[PDB]
Structures are given as C-alpha cells and as structure tokens.
Curated annotation (Swiss-Prot), chain A:
It is linked to Pfeiffer syndrome: A syndrome characterized by the association of craniosynostosis, broad and deviated thumbs and big toes, and partial syndactyly of the fingers and toes. Three subtypes are known: mild autosomal dominant form (type 1); cloverleaf skull, elbow ankylosis, early death, sporadic (type 2); craniosynostosis, early demise, sporadic (type 3). It comes from Homo sapiens (Human). Glycans are attached at N81, N94, N118, N163. GO terms for biological process: angiogenesis; auditory receptor cell development; branching involved in salivary gland morphogenesis; calcium ion homeostasis; cardiac muscle cell proliferation; cell maturation; cell migration; cell projection assembly. One of its GO terms (molecular function) is fibroblast growth factor receptor activity. It comes from the Eukaryota. Disulfide bonds join C32-C84, C131-C174. Autophosphorylated. Binding of FGF family members together with heparan sulfate proteoglycan or heparin promotes receptor dimerization and autophosphorylation on tyrosine residues. Autophosphorylation occurs in trans between the two FGFR molecules present in the dimer and proceeds in a highly ordered manner. The lineage of its organism: Eukaryota, Metazoa, Chordata, Craniata, Vertebrata. Residues 12-100, 109-190 form the Ig-like C2-type domain. Residues 14-31 are annotated as: Heparin-binding. The chain holds residues 147 to 359 of 822 of the full protein. Keywords: ATP-binding, Cell membrane, Chromosomal rearrangement, Craniosynostosis, Cytoplasm, Cytoplasmic vesicle, Disease variant, Disulfide bond, Dwarfism, Glycoprotein, Heparin-binding, Holoprosencephaly, Hypogonadotropic hypogonadism, Immunoglobulin domain, Intellectual disability, Kallmann syndrome, Kinase, Membrane, Nucleotide-binding, Nucleus, Phosphoprotein, Receptor, Repeat, Signal, Transcription, Transcription regulation, Transferase, Transmembrane, Transmembrane helix, Tyrosine-protein kinase, Ubl conjugation. Changing E128G: In HH2; also found in a family member with isolated anosmia.
Swiss-Prot record, chains B, D:
Belongs to the heparin-binding growth factors family. It is found in: Secreted; Cytoplasm; Cytoplasm, Cell cortex; Cytoplasm, Cytosol. Transmembrane segments: none annotated. The chain holds residues 23 to 153 of 155 of the full protein. The keyword RNA-binding does not apply. The lineage of its organism: Eukaryota, Metazoa, Chordata, Craniata, Vertebrata. It comes from the Eukaryota. Monomer. Homodimer. Interacts with FGFR1, FGFR2, FGFR3 and FGFR4. Affinity between fibroblast growth factors (FGFs) and their receptors is increased by heparan sulfate glycosaminoglycans that function as coreceptors. Found in a complex with FGFBP1, FGF1 and FGF2. Interacts with FGFBP1. Part of a Cu(2+)-dependent multiprotein aggregate containing FGF1, S100A13 and SYT1. Interacts with SYT1. Interacts with S100A13. Interacts with LRRC59. Interacts with CSNKA, CSNKB and FIBP. While binding with LRRC59, CSNKA and FIBP seem mutually exclusive, CSNKB and FIBP may cooperatively interact with FGF1. The gene is FGF1. In the nucleus, phosphorylated by PKC/PRKCD. A motif (Nuclear localization signal) lies at residues 2-5. It comes from Homo sapiens. Changing Y87A: No effect on integrin- and heparin-binding, loss of FGFR1-binding, defective in inducing FGF1 signaling, cell proliferation and cell migration. Changing K111R: No effect on LRRC59-binding. This is Fibroblast growth factor 1. Keywords: Acetylation, Angiogenesis, Cytoplasm, Developmental protein, Differentiation, Growth factor, Heparin-binding, Mitogen, Nucleus, Phosphoprotein, Secreted.
UniProtKB/Swiss-Prot annotation, chain C:
Changing I93T: In HH2; some patients also carry PROKR2 and GNRH1 mutations; impairs the tertiary folding resulting in incomplete glycosylation and reduced cell surface expression. It is linked to Pfeiffer syndrome: A syndrome characterized by the association of craniosynostosis, broad and deviated thumbs and big toes, and partial syndactyly of the fingers and toes. Three subtypes are known: mild autosomal dominant form (type 1); cloverleaf skull, elbow ankylosis, early death, sporadic (type 2); craniosynostosis, early demise, sporadic (type 3). Tyrosine-protein kinase that acts as a cell-surface receptor for fibroblast growth factors and plays an essential role in the regulation of embryonic development, cell proliferation, differentiation and migration. Required for normal mesoderm patterning and correct axial organization during embryonic development, normal skeletogenesis and normal development of the gonadotropin-releasing hormone (GnRH) neuronal system. Phosphorylates PLCG1, FRS2, GAB1 and SHB. Ligand binding leads to the activation of several signaling cascades. This is Fibroblast growth factor receptor 1. The gene is FGFR1.
Length: 192, 131, 191, 131
C-alpha cells in the first residue's frame, strides 16, 4: 500500500546502554524503538534461542506499541543476552542487550558458626583464631580481647598471637559490622 | 567482599573507572583494565575504593570532582549505604553535610558532586563480579 | 639392636573409617597406630604433596606417641586426602584418609530481599510470586493471603490462576525452621 | 535445601542407606545408588527422608527399627534438630517421648532406637552433597 521502507531505529541513542545490571527482584524492560513500512514485526530471543513466556517464572509482556519487553521480578536464572528482532518484507534489524542480576543482602554481617573456636596451647605456642564473615555492604572487622570491657587488638580473617603466655589466656572476640548492624562470636584460649 | 568488584552505575550502564592519570569516569567495557575496584572499610560504613590496577584511591576534591589519588586521605573516604531501592550510593565523607554523591552522567562523564541529588539515577551504583 | 620388624598396623580396625566428614570449626584428629623395630617414623601428606604446618592457618600437631595428627578449627580449604606414612629400615606402610568439612548455619531461614515483589495485573491474568529461601535445617514454606497481628489464610512460587479483583491484596511467603521463622510480603494490584 | 543429600553418620563414617527391600543400614561407598536422600518438612522441624532411587521413606517401627516405607506415614516423620555440637540428630516423631533416635552402629548396622542415647556418636549425622 505505501512506499517500502526497511526497518530502522527510532531512538538509536537509548540503545547505546548495552548492559543492564539490575538488583534481583526489579522489573526489567528492554526497548528497540523502530519503524519501517509496511510496519515491522517484533520478536525476542534469549541467548540465541526463541524466548517463550513459559521459559521463565512470571513470564513476560511485550508492548508492541513501545517496541519493548517487560520482565517483572528478575532473578539470576534470568541473566543472559536478549535480542530483539525487527523485520518486514524488506529487511530485518536486530540488537542485543546483556542482562545481569545481583541479589542484594541488606542484613548485618554473618559470621561462620563455630569460628573462632576455643583453643588450648602450651606456654610459648603461637596461635591463630579464624573468623569467616559474609556481608554485601563492606564489613569492618575488629578483634577484641576481654579484660564487658574490651581491648581492641586488630582493626581493619585471622587473629595471630605470637609467643603466648598465661596472660594471653582468656576470651577473644571477632566483631564485624556494617551500616545495617554488627555481629560477633567469641572463643576462649586456654594456656598450659 | 574481599574480592575486587566493579561499581556499575545505573544512569547509563557505565562501570566506574579510575584512569592512571587521575581521571575518574565511566566506560561500557568490562575488559578495561581500570574498572576493578577494591573497597575497604576504615570504620563501619566508611569505605576506601581503589583501583587494583593502579592502586589509586577514588576521591573527591573540594570542588566536588572525582579523581584518582596516589595515596589515601580524607578526600578518599566515602559513606556506603545500601538503599531501600537495593542500589548503593556513596557520599563524600568529607563533604557529607552538603550531601555530595559519587555519581556519573548519561555519558559516563564525572558528575560534579554539588550537582547530585538524592533522586538521581547518576548516584545509584551496583556491585558486580569482575566476570 | 633388636630383631628387625617391618612397620605394621596396631589397630587396623579403627582405620576402616576412611572418610571423615566434619562440620566446620571442629578439631580433626587422624591416627595410624603402628609398630615395628627399629621403631618407625611418622610423616603426613596432603593430596600427595608434603604437608608442612604453615600450609594452613592454625598449623597442626603430631602426637608421635599416638600415631596421630591434630588439626584444630578445620575449614573448607582443609578438605582433602591425608596420608600417614610409617617406615623404618625394613619397610614402609601407609594409609589415606579423606576429609570433608561442612559449614553449618544455625539461624532461622533467610529470604531473598525483594521477593516476593509487588505486581499489578489485568483481570483474568495469571500470576506468580517468587520466594527464595536459604536454610541449613529443612525449611517449611507456606504462602499466606491476608484477609496485634493480621488474619491470614494459608494457601518457591505461588501461582494464582484466572485472577479477579477479589484476588487483589497482600500476600506473604513464610519459611521457618527449628531455630525461628521469617517472611516477606508483597501486594498484588488488579486492573 | 531442595537438592538430595547424604546423611553421613559420624560413628563409623557410614552413609545412611535405604536398600530397595526395606533394609536400612550404612555404607562407606558414595557411588552406591541408594544413599541419596530427599528431606522434606511436613511442618516446621519435622521431616520426611526418602530415597531418591526407590522412593522409600525412612521409618521406625514400634520396635525402634529403621526400615524403608513404600508410602509415608506417622512412622516416617522425624524431628530434625541442629545440635550445638553442629551435628544433626533425628528423633522419631512417633516415639519422641521415649527419645528414640535414628542412629547407626560402628559397623553401620541399624541401631535399635531404644538403645540410642543423647550422648552417642551413633545418633550424630552430617548432611553432605552427593559429590
């Protein structure tokens, strides 16, 4: 009916941002604004293969008017390349977006249970206490000796006591804290 | 949390970059050798952010301009907050009162701290693994 | 000085238990009771290579009297094959133990933040809410519809068929274990 | 927690096994096709334990004898508790009052529930990944 026109980008700019990194649970939308006559088709692929809505929990909508696909609540399994393919009887163009998802953990730091563990050593023995911390936001770790009164020992995984003596005996604590809260585990050092 | 990361900015998809000459900007290339950062806590909530490649610290001048620092100082410490929207924001510890954010513009160019607002996409960052 | 005797096991039985699976942080001890004349030597290997005490944090003791090696506070990096080697001028015997470590997490379940997430849909649309749970002990998961605590209606994903206006409202994903329980909610809007 | 595991018993290094004939015992072979278990919570703290291979549930008879069950029932539910010593213990839900544990002997042979004590190594179990 009208003058043929191969499909072309209507907002190439917006498409410059290739990688979409999103925190888990956010709704992700991809657009490939396009035009062409006769009016072109919109299809979407995930890592090369066809992408049907049953391919993921939640499925996904495609607003043909806004040349976009909308995926609610993205999760790691969703990570991958998404390609839109626009085409008509006179041409086909395409574009690919990378999608990365990161699960955010807004809790105070978590210490590995059991660590540090009690220890019994002989006078003169060197000693090491371990502490395993997990924290999305940057954790600040400190080791504390009990004298509850305390004596900061080290300030930012292991507390190292050189040529230990009886005075070295006692309770020790590994403290880790972030913007949300702080956590700690203690252990007792016995000396013989 | 001990591994180096990339601070991806949601405003244009740029990875926070600290060029060896002190230039702070963004790029869309993950193979770039200067996007890998090592964040550290000097104290609870306050962090250093330094290039693993050059060993330069991310810092903000009294103008509100991001730059690489050969050695750490008051201008290098940033307040790290995980926002409710699940993104991270980094506020200049030294210019906190004014609410000076570490941000980036639609084109990845350094965004003057005094032009950053709480509701901007420019100050929203996401930690990512190198690969 | 005395009649030669190649090294031999003094408690072969105890050695039957080849694999030592231990929860992280426990002290692990390995023994190879042996005898032989002249009195034999005791050395230990980790995955074939020599095992020096600086090879791991904490180090490790070897009670030569009890033919054993003692490693305090074991952690994942410690996992591997440990071989004792007993030998004298007349022979050498050996034995290898497998060591596995598991970090235990005694906390109530943990739900992935953001999940489930709010959703708005059209009348008739089917819907699915997600919930990601982590829990060392077996978690018990329940989905709750809301109707000094609120009334709920017991119902990784919650699936709502041909939704209607009545379907609109708040939903909760509850998970609990012997330590405690946790939950996250989300609101479903319908148009 | 959805993946099948192995319930390693610290008494002799045996992996809890449910032989296709209903025989419950232990073995020191990880390639054995009948040591993979799928634990499920009927309610908080109460679990079913079934062989992935045969679909038999671990159960305890009124004698205090472990056996494989073609279908789940009261004799299949066990109370799962992560002990302070960081091990797991499974008490017969039905024979709780008497404190009947799921345990195993030095040779991996079924250990009659009425002969199991709180301080025994026989009732201590550790969850492990198949490989």
């Amino acid at each position: 009916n009208r003058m043929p026109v191969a499909p072309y980008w209507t907002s190439p700019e917006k498409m410059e941002k290739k990688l979409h990194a999103v925190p888990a649970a956010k709704t992700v939308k991809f657009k490939c604004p396009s035009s062409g006559t006769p009016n072109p088709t919109l299809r979407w692929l995930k890592n090369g293969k066809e992408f049907k809505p049953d391919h993921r929990i939640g499925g996904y909508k495609v607003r043909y008017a806004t040349w976009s696909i909308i995926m609610d609540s993205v999760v790691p399994s969703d990570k991958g390349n998404y390609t839109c393919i626009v085409e008509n009887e006179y041409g086909s163009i395409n574009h690919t977006y990378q999608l990365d998802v990161v699960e955010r953990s807004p809790h105070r730091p978590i210490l590995q249970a059991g660590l540090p563990a009690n220890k019994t050593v002989a006078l003169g023995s060197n000693v090491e206490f371990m502490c395993k911390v997990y924290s999305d936001p940057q954790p600040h770790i400190q080791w504390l000796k009990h004298i509850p009164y305390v004596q900061i020992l080290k300030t930012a995984e292991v507390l190292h006591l050189r040529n230990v003596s009886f005075e070295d005996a006692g309770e020790y604590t590994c403290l880790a804290g972030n913007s949300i809260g702080l956590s700690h585990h203690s252990a007792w050092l016995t000396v013989l | 949390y001990k591994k180096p990361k990339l601070l991806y900015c949601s405003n244009g998809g740029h990875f926070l970059r600290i060029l060896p000459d002190g230039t702070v900007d963004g790029t869309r290339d993950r193979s770039d050798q200067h996007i890998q950062l090592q964040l550290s806590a000097e104290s609870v909530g306050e962090v250093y952010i330094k290039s693993t490649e050059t060993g330069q610290y991310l810092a903000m001048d009294t103008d509100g301009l991001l730059y690489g620092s050969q050695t750490p100082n008051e201008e290098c410490l940033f307040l790290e907050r995980l926002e409710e929207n699940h993104y991270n924001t980094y506020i200049s510890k030294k210019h906190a009162e004014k609410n000076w954010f570490v941000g980036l513009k639609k084109n990845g160019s350094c965004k003057r701290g005094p032009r950053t607002h709480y509701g901007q996409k420019a100050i929203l960052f996401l930690p990512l693994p190198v690969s």
